[PDB]
Amino acid sequence: GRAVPGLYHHPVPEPDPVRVEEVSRRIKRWAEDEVQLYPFDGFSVGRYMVGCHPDAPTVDHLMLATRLMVAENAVDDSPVGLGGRLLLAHTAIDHFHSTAEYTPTWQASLAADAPRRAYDSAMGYFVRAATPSQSDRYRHDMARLHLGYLAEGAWAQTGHVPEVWEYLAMRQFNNFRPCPTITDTVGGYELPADLHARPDMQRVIALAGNATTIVNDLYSYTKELNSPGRHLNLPVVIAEREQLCERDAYLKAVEVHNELQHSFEAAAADLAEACPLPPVLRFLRGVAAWVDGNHDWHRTNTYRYSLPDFW
Amino acid sequence: GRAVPGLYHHPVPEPDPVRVEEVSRRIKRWAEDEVQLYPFDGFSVGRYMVGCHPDAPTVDHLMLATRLMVAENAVDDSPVGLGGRLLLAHTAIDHFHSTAEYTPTWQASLAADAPRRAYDSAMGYFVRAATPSQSDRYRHDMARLHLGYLAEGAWAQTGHVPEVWEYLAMRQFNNFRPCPTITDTVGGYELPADLHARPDMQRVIALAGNATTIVNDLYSYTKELNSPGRHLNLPVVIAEREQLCERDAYLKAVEVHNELQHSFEAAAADLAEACPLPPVLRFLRGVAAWVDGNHDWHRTNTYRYSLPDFW
Numbered sequence: 001g002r003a004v005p006g007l008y009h010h011p012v013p014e015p016d017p018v019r020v021e022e023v024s025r026r027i028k029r030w031a032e033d034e035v036q037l038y039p040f041d042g043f044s045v046g047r048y049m050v051g052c053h054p055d056a057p058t059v060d061h062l063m064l065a066t067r068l069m070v071a072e073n074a075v076d077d078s079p080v081g082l083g084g085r086l087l088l089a090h091t092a093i094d095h096f097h098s099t100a101e102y103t104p105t106w107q108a109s110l111a112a113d114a115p116r117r118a119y120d121s122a123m124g125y126f127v128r129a130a131t132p133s134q135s136d137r138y139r140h141d142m143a144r145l146h147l148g149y150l151a152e153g154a155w156a157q158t159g160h161v162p163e164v165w166e167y168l169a170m171r172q173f174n175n176f177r178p179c180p181t182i183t184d185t186v187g188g189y190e191l192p193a194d195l196h197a198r199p200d201m202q203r204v205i206a207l208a209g210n211a212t213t214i215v216n217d218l219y220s221y222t223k224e225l226n227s228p229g230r231h232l233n234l235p236v237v238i239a240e241r242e243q244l245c246e247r248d249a250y251l252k253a254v255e256v257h258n259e260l261q262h263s264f265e266a267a268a269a270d271l272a273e274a275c276p277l278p279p280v281l282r283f284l285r286g287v288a289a290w291v292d293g294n295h296d297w298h299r300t301n302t303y304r305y306s307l308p309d310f311w
Numbered sequence: 312g313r314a315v316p317g318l319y320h321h322p323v324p325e326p327d328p329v330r331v332e333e334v335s336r337r338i339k340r341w342a343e344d345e346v347q348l349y350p351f352d353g354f355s356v357g358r359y360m361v362g363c364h365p366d367a368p369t370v371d372h373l374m375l376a377t378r379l380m381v382a383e384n385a386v387d388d389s390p391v392g393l394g395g396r397l398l399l400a401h402t403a404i405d406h407f408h409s410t411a412e413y414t415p416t417w418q419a420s421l422a423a424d425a426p427r428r429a430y431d432s433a434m435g436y437f438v439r440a441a442t443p444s445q446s447d448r449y450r451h452d453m454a455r456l457h458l459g460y461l462a463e464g465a466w467a468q469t470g471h472v473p474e475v476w477e478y479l480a481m482r483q484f485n486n487f488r489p490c491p492t493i494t495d496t497v498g499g500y501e502l503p504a505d506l507h508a509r510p511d512m513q514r515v516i517a518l519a520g521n522a523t524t525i526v527n528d529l530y531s532y533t534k535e536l537n538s539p540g541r542h543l544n545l546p547v548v549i550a551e552r553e554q555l556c557e558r559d560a561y562l563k564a565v566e567v568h569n570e571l572q573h574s575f576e577a578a579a580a581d582l583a584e585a586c587p588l589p590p591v592l593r594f595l596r597g598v599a600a601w602v603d604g605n606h607d608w609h610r611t612n613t614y615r616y617s618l619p620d621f622w
């Protein structure tokens with residue numbers, strides 16, 4: 001249950017057990033009764049989402065994020081035909097438009113497997129609740145994610161080890177980013193689209209996702225040593241390119257995380273000063289909350305993750 | 312110089328020769344002196360862009376679209392590592408954010424090849440001219456395009472022939488769409504982001520891109536018979552799945568185009584009535600103009616394209 005030594009992070013309060021438990025039961029019923037996601041603890045994802053969205057006004061708001069997070073996972077369920085699989089699944093998020101003949105056939109494919117059932121349903125709820133701007137913004141962040149996956153899968157098909165910055169670029173896209181960027185939707189307000197689009201806000205979001213995603217590299221490092229092949233993460237890539245020992249490579253990855261997290265904070269503090277509108281200040285706080293909550297989930301989840309003996 | 316018989320389209324005026332010629336010279340200088348795009352007629356792309364953007368206030372506005380269209384092409388210059396290549400090129404469009412150590416190395420990669428030089432420069436000009444909303448919107452349409460490419464490349468690696476609707480879904484993404492959706496930027500006004508994001512506007516745009524992209528399937532069909540392997544387009548896919556003769560499959564593809572184009576028009580007429588704001592009405596007209604101009608460019612370009620003897 002201990003943090004990575006030297007990892008810069010913020011502790012968080014225990015997540016409201018009443019909420020965790022309610023999310024768990026509703027998420028189990030959705031998975032089983034609505035989308036037949038299998039022929040998985042609700043508790044894991046409930047602690048995750050309650051911890052990451054402390055400002056959600058209701059469990060209904062929390063369930064917007066929870067179903068999308070679970071659907072994200074159903075999709076990870078060779079890489080050779082990945083680009084075709086992911087494109088079709090993307091249509092459950094950004095709909096196909098076609099003729100009266102071909103539309104119904106696409107429509108049937110949305111029931112065809114767990115990942116597409118999961119997405120069609122989870123997105124369905126999101127689109128009813130969110131503004132059209134918040135929906136479009138999510139589709140863009142999902143198109144990023146799928147691109148990230150496809151870079152990673154392309155490298156895996158040849159065992160290619162990218163340069164460190166190249167791995168970092170992939171991991172900018174193959175990245176938690178679609179989760180914190182729905183903080184406004186889940187918080188019951190809107191960050192206006194013209195403000196989301198500012199270059200400074202875009203930089204704040206990218207840094208945040210980049211830091212909180214390297215958190216996962218650091219906590220899941222030991223588990224990934226057993227993944228098929230040579231599964232890439234920042235320590236592994238640093239070690240291989242910068243020809244360092246595993247230990248020093250990992251410690252450097254911790255320092256990289258720290259600089260990304262510190263830069264995220266400085267960038268958010270600056271935007272808060274430059275543009276102190278309420279929906280901006282709340283969004284910035286919710287992104288930091290999602291980030292702190294994501295570190296806490298990784299830290300406490302000793303079922304999935306464990307630490308290397310480098311200290 | 313003849314249209315596909317039975318293809319529903321709108322004729323267009325001859326493109327202003329003064330403008331075509333000016334675009335050609337400036338685009339040749341950009342390619343040669345700014346981005347070293349080779350160690351290509353300016354005239355082809357000039358007729359293309361003047362024809363597609365009759366409302367551009369200046370050649371500077373036209374050159375925003377022209378450099379992006381040319382950069383798009385430099386990128387098409389096995390599919391196995393495609394997802395890694397395209398991700399890195401995407402960073403020239405949607406920037407990498409990283410540490411003081413890794414940022415400069417990424418920064419150097421932007422000069423490394425023609426495609427990334429082309430994008431970094433072309434996007435550079437776009438970002439200075441457009442609103443932050445118009446920039447974000449372009450990055451999303453480019454992330455769509457790259458996903459489309461990667462589906463197509465994944466299928467090509469196994470010679471997979473998708474179902475027709477599946478091919479159509481890919482071709483929704485691997486699609487001209489980033490070109491007409493910058494019509495406002497090129498026209499010197501803005502479609503507001505909240506209005507762009509409406510589901511009805513999203514459907515109008517998708518149909519338009521879907522029709523004008525099947526135009527390219529129909530005009531480039533004969534050329535593609537010679538592409539390495541079995542290059543997919545709508546007639547080829549219809550023939551193979553619906554086991555039809557090449558001719559009848561092509562004629563059906565013409566009917567599919569016609570229904571997409573008619574549906575695009577009905578959908579735009581409806582939105583124009585539901586929401587008759589000026590920036591909406593102008594954007595709708597500019598999308599139709601881009602679509603009509605794209606058909607005319609395909610029709611007149613007998614250097615790249617020619618027709619099957621099916622009539």
Ligand SMILES: CC(C)=CCC/C(C)=C(\F)COP(=O)(O)OP(=O)(O)O
Pocket residue numbers: 069072073145174175176177178179213216220304
């Ligand atoms: C948008 C969502 C929900 C997830 C984004 C994808 C990411 C970053 C992960 F799944 C975590 O990395 P990884 O794939 O290495 O996961 P594990 O280490 O836990 O297996």
Ligand SMILES: CC(C)=CCC/C(C)=C(\F)COP(=O)(O)OP(=O)(O)O
Pocket residue numbers: 380383384456485486487488489490524527531615
């Ligand atoms: C955004 C831009 C500029 C282009 C989108 C990609 C598309 C649809 C094409 F290049 C045309 O199809 P295709 O690849 O079959 O081109 P050709 O038939 O002319 O070789």
Ligand SMILES: [Mg+2]
Pocket residue numbers: 076
């Ligand atoms: Mg993964």
Ligand SMILES: [Mg+2]
Pocket residue numbers: 216217220221224
């Ligand atoms: Mg991991």
Ligand SMILES: [Mg+2]
Pocket residue numbers: 387
């Ligand atoms: Mg192509």
Ligand SMILES: [Mg+2]
Pocket residue numbers: 527528531532535
């Ligand atoms: Mg073609």
